[PDB]
């Protein structure tokens, strides 16, 4: 399955919120590239044949195992929306 | 290899010709062989003599007498071989000898007029219509005549119906209303029957003397004496009851149209309505119907007996004389001959109206052949009946059994006005008279269950859709060889024994004998028996009579097994089943698939394509072979020679194999070693595990031929030329296209390779191998405008058809099945080393999951497996009748002999009992299978008697704990059409009206996603998934283009706009006077469109 | 089978009442119960005027309850577009995009599942960009 | 509520598109609009020139019936196409209403692009979160994914060269198969049974490349689908968007849906064969 | 049943991944031991118990007196038919009991008996047909034939008996072929009527509830007995308590979802005889405008945890209603 | 930008129709067989529905025409519905 799906159901009230947040996370991971990660130093996804899971074999698992750490914060209205919604799509 | 038969029953008669129904029907319909002078008139000659002799007494140029003399037809324009190579109809033109007479002088006789072309039936029983061949299935419906049915509401009374044919004809209904009313509605308006009774000239005194003497319900008609003294003015009043507005001075307008010929049925004398009449009521019905026109007055022989006997039934009781709607004695089968005759007479009546009009507008007289008869109406009627009718269906030439069963298949539905798909649950069930006439198992599962059926093997239609079952006459206690074919109504009067009753030869050996009094299983003494069943085979169909152990199988599983037997593809090296029933030779003989020696003689030459045989008369005859003939379903029909040069043959002896025959035996499938034990998971629920042994030697291998076609036609831009040249690029791949446009024969082809090079306006539109699979090109046919005898679709200059053959071998995707319905799919093909094997080195072929046996009820396959086990060592085949097979002691003794042979061969090599076998024996001893205290010799023998032998795993080497049943079973590979083929596509052609993706010939096309899948997808929280799968992936052209471009660019797909589905919806509401705009939170409109709604 | 589903369908089966004592509209008309819930709340309590909209609960089959709906998209897609569209056209019918069939026809985000406005939008940001934007926040609070 | 100016549909909603040889297949809306325009122009010139009163009434009736036919066909007579083709014309009501109309055709969406179907076989060597996918349909289903991923490496210079190289199976290479297994390392596909009687008739799975023709299915879902192995077929869909991939992998993945929604009973319960085996091992 | 309980308990106490891994390993070992253990079906495995033979004789003897009882005119057709039906349906059960007693006593490891005892395949009726007798066979009119089927598939059926069983085969086939589409149409109706229900909510202040009974109001004309465990489970499992209840020294607070253990405890308490009805929140009393609230809806899902806010419970409700209709 | 919440369906004034449409169509000439381009002001005219070449063709999906009938007409639905809207 996926790492700690029960844990993932732990910190979110509704599973649909979980789906939204993880997929949106994958969306920035695509748009800025996988440089904007918060698990860089030691614990990265580890591919079998090589270290291919360093860059981008699957963004959804990247976002999920990003969420298991405490470095991800989500909310209904956490940031003034307009600034980052116009700065996200333009780079 | 010997064959041993088990059944102890003497078949007093053999199977009648399995396809005789269609052959006899059509040969009676077409009397071409007999001279036209012969008395035989029913069929097409009946239609001619009935309608065509138009007479005109006085209308303008009176004296018009167009009479019929003879008819003839003797030469098809082309042989049926070209008729299949070139898409013609295997037909013969019809000529009629007609002649014209006037009241004045003149006898203008035209001997030969071509009036339509009528198709001719082939030897087997099919018809070739346009290239392909079809079969016209027999139909079952109400037998014409007189029936009495209880009132749907009123329980005390009932109604009578006299039902002639055609539907555009009489339909008489008699009913009794207690106030003294005998109501009779003719077509749509009810009418007091007493007026019509007076019309026929019956007066009151003899009516009371001969009818009202016994019954007190005579007051139901004797009450109406006010208008029963009117001989002829009754005719005027009755015609006034009709409302045509015409003057009443038409004595024989509608009063006589129910006379001799026009309206009332011409049901065959004696039976078709008279047997339904004369035995049902009265004594005999002289003539064809009720009529009198020799004196202007009217006479009948029907209405008086009908009213008398109805009054007897409603008052007293002559008998339980209520006719069941589904009783088979009151149902009648229209064969292909009857359907063809009816369509022919419809077309002939159309021609009669046309010629009447032509005469009415005709001025002079010497115009008999041309200005009178035109072939267009009758030809069109015949062609439409043989092309687009419901009962003329594509022949299923998958194997001889399929074609034979299709030829002997009876349908309850048909043109539509008889019975249709929606609701038929009342009639789908079988009846007590189906015993020996209709197989209660042949019905196909699905919507058409019970409606479509097949008749019994011993069943025979006599002359009028009335199936007769054979029966042996029993006199006292001796069973006589005399055989009588009996009808249902005749059958319901005697006591019928059963074929399995013990017999002393010519004497019944039982005290209590089972019987059917009237469709009711009872027990009687031998002295009260009159008739005996000929054979159990008569109670089931041909396709059912092929199942060996039917007595130990379930009805549903028998149904599906018999259905899969029909769709078994023939194999390259097929072989007859180890356990057979005894009908395989009859099936291969009666279905014209093999070649037989018509007379005693010696073979002269045997080649791969023809056999020249010199008979004893000194005449040598050459038999060609359809070496590789594509079937309707795409299989292959081959005749393999079975004789050697200079070999003596006997009369009726085999010459060459059929498509699926070993040596005069129906062989569609293989005999394999099957072990019934659950393997790891690869036989989970119904799946099947097979060795590579069946693949290392080609053992389940078949030939499949696909027929591609392409047209070059004349367009407004210009003609399309099929040329070797390719316009733009392909020249390196053109090397395969050796000749002009067509690919060279014998060249292997892959999907996506050019096959026919056709050029348009220069634009390349070339037929290519479809994505998927391709084999070896074998044949190419080109038909151009230079027509020798061929025709083309208008505007098409030429056509080419290409046949590609490929050798399908058994693989994972395929499915297999036995004769007992145990469907399966090959789930894994194991190597030979890791399959279970006997103590001897021989490994088993196929592994079957036991759990499928108790869930269903098919113990027949277990007995078959035991008998196949015995046969594998004894090296012999067995024949067992379905309900007179081998008892358990017999197969036990055979297994004992087989074990004797097997273990004696084991000991001859100098070996005892393996240690693995010793511990397995001890384990089985703890399980109670084998009696304790015995040596491994007799313990293992007793284990063999159970049909179980020790097996070794082959992967571990350790024996399988507990014994396993193993044996030889007959398994056939089922017809494998596009059903498995991967309709898997990504991007292909899209539809034109809407942008839904749909392919077909070019690409497979998408998958149904319907509404139930929408509901299931949206039961989950799936939101964007449904949005993409309904708009991005299905409808939005720019959305799917952008998605494709983005995924090529490796980016997330863009969001859809307010989707073009809803923008189309808004613009469609905009098209009418409507007003649709999307609103924000407050009452201020939000423009869906960017700036496109604003003008300028 | 659990009883939640049967209870759900039975509730949807009897969501209709027909008023008997007229209020601000005709009397012999029946539709959604919650509409008179709100209307009685307004008439008696939210606004002045003690006019009791005395209703009786109407029990109609699955078919009739499906047919009579406040939204006209589902009704048009259900049985007959002509009559339904005519009725919805006589009066300006502001069809609320409540219900799932309607949003299927609209092709927009389905209200259920992920498309619920409760979870439809949910800002997500990683921790380091959170520190960056929060530093921008506290420096935006000047002095 | 009676209309004075009649709106005219945009052309692409009712296009006359060529089929073959210059002939154009047309929506009947164009024919009805042409008829109405002809009638209106006749009325215009008639009123312009002169007013024969009976003729004016007749042509007023003609225009009114033409407008009637345009708005909808069938209610007053049966206006038809050019004589010889007795097929009634298709009107605005026909496009909107009907079993196959604007409302009833978006509600089903009978066709989907990335889909396939095949016969299914037991997949006992696979785990419950996996499904066996034949290599050929796996290759073709993810075709744009394959193109992009092998463009990431130097297998082909551009996408067009990739399409031309993959257009024939004689040029397949093991590098292509490595790219394939790279593509679908985290992707999932939706398996679907034709009669979808409940929610579990759609189930996500992780594809595993296999050699063969049939789709290998985990035996334990043999009852979630009402699918035996008597040869009946089952279909596969591939969602593209990463958002939809998240949806399928989170809430439609079969490893997460082990209990019924109809009750608390499990649907991934051990099936017949496993039950028999474990009964045999734990019997005294 | 033990496997199902095991899986459910593991799901409750471990979660998602562990239950999946347990299922994987359990299936793998079940396959391996089913292979190596060697379960096979032969014609001798369908053992025929001998004692049933004298049973038949007694039944036969009884028929004679009944026939004689009908010969003296003491019986009418309807009551004679009822007596014969009762006798045959009683002796069939007697033979089945004898068959199972024989299989217990003599052959614990018989393949038919092992798959009957376990949940693999088959029913006692199917095993009786295989080994005992498929006595009563129904007529096309809907009644049942007077003459039963004495033989089994271990033995050979007479021609007449197979012809008779064809009637029931055809009946079942047609019934399936129609009820499939009929149930699909029913599901269509349900989804059309209930497609508006979606759980979007703050907990509605519903001071209302439904009292789910714990005793059958009428199992006899006037008597109370605790409902069948399955019924109470389907009425209470996954609900929300309307108000606090304390029944056996345990304080079930108001607003607490009834888990499986709570349902069992309530059933045991009702067995002791403390309470007879449970007040629970329900959709029937929810005050949510378009949908139901989480509290009023409940706790049952694909998981066990309380329902997430925002799922179309109406569609899944319709599907759960309609899916079993096909095999009904 | 704002989410769609209500869809209002209503009747149309003649002034509403005139504001909605961009020009009037008055020839019965969609497209000639010779001139594959729109022939004249007919049902497919170029300048009234937007260009057929590459705004996109979606104006020819969105922009609509109109016909100014000299004689008024009534919608068939409001005269033929089972409750005749004019008749009621
Ligand atoms: Mg199946
Ligand atoms: Zn609530």
Numbering used by the authors:
A (entry chain K): 2 to 92
B (entry chain I): 1 to 761, 785 to 1119
C (entry chain J): 1363 to 1505
D (entry chain J): 512 to 795
E (entry chain J): 909 to 1236
F (entry chain J): 2 to 55, 81 to 114
Authors' description from the paper:
Transcription termination is an essential step in transcription by RNA polymerase (RNAP) and crucial for gene regulation. Rho forms a ring-shaped homo-hexameric complex, mediated by the CTD.
Cryo-EM maps of Rho, apo RNAP, EC, and type 1 and type 2 complexes are shown. When the apo RNAP structure is superimposed with the Rho-engaged EC structure, the opened clamp in apo RNAP fits with the bottom parts of the Rho hexamer without severe steric clash (protomers E and F).
